């Protein structure tokens, strides 16, 4: 019956079937309960959408159309929860936040 | 050659959904693929440990919800739990 996919059944963009296959073959459990890939794909899609929206906002404030890893770093480090999630994570070609300590300024 | 899979078309679909004027570079796509794989590994490992602790041999959406409550910080975890519950409800209500 035309073989509609599970992501369109769940109304997602991230693949339910590929996430199910990676959960099955990734040596996590004996069984996968078939609603777990839907939840996983939804959580991954939400986190991707939040990061991409903040990065696109940073690129728009930087007057750039395209997102570079600097925009991803500026999106991640300016958010407390995103920086808590990726505290031990290095983003390549992302740089650092502009931050000079207040004592080092003149006068 | 050998067909290596990624999340590039999926992240691009999400990007064109939330920003239908804004492109992305190859390096930023590599960052996004690494992010999705890392968070997948974290949530799946926490759900695997949660299933192993309670003498369960399956991973259900309850294990994934509890893992999302564990790794993710507060409002991030709350909105991710809302998104996952909405998706599982839509998947169950529609075959």
């Amino acid at each position, epitope marked *: 019956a035309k073989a509609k996919s599970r992501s369109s059944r769940a109304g997602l963009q991230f693949p339910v079937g590929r996430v199910h296959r990676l959960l099955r073959k990734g040596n996590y459990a004996e069984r996968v309960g078939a609603g777990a890939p839907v939840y996983m794909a939804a959580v991954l899609e939400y986190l991707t959408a939040e990061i991409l929206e903040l990065a696109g906002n940073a690129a728009r404030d930087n007057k750039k159309t395209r997102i570079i890893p600097r925009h991803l770093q500026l999106a991640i480090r*300016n958010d407390e929860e995103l920086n808590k999630l990726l505290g031990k994570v290095t983003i390549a070609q992302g740089g650092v936040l502009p931050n000079i300590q207040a004592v080092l300024l003149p006068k | 050659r050998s067909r290596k899979e990624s999340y590039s078309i999926y992240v691009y679909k999400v990007l064109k959904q939330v920003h239908p004027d804004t492109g992305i570079s190859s390096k930023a796509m590599g960052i996004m693929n690494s992010f999705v794989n890392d968070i997948f590994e974290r949530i799946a490992g926490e759900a695997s440990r949660l299933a192993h602790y309670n003498k369960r041999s399956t991973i259900t959406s309850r294990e994934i919800q509890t893992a999302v409550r564990l790794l993710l910080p507060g409002e991030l975890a709350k909105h991710a739990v809302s998104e996952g519950t909405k998706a599982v409800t839509k998947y169950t209500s529609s075959k």
Partner: single-chain antibody
Amino acid sequence: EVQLQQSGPELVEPGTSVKMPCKASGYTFTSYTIQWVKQTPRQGLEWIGYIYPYNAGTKYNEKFKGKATLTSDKSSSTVYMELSSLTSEDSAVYYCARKSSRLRSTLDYWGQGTSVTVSDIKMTQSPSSMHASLGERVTITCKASQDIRSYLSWYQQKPWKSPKTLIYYATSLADGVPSRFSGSGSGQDFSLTINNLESDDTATYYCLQHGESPYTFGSGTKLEIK
């Protein structure tokens, strides 16, 4: 748990400056922005700006740029608001509200508001004022001038009280709000539905967009029962 303590009313002479405290408790203070909303009976609610205590990040409305100054003090968990060069049109109630840095999140918990007396995208709400019975259905429209990605919230305000968050993300219910209220719509067309009425529902209902950089409230509907 979560509360935003605000000071009493101010009787200020014009041309001076006034400080406003927003002492906060019950949550991790640095992880949530504090927004400031001004409320006059002639222009309704107007979003002024916000402070992020994580990086002390400011953002102001264009009509309040320079006139308003936001500061944060993380030691006492306090947010200060400065108004300088007080024009005679400053007699208004000022609320400070908590809002997470997540885009889906809204102004969930509000302060009591300080009454100060001097001595973009436009939300169109179709019913200005309507009458409903004890068990009728209420439908309120919030037609938007531009497009927003479902970033609309519905608030209920009693007379002489702080607004109460009903609906966030245009469909999701707030914490503690009963399931009688139901939000619907997306894009430019939104609606709030009250299922069955009580005597509590005599209030003014507003819709706020936060999909773009200037946040805009709606005109508001006055709903009174019997």
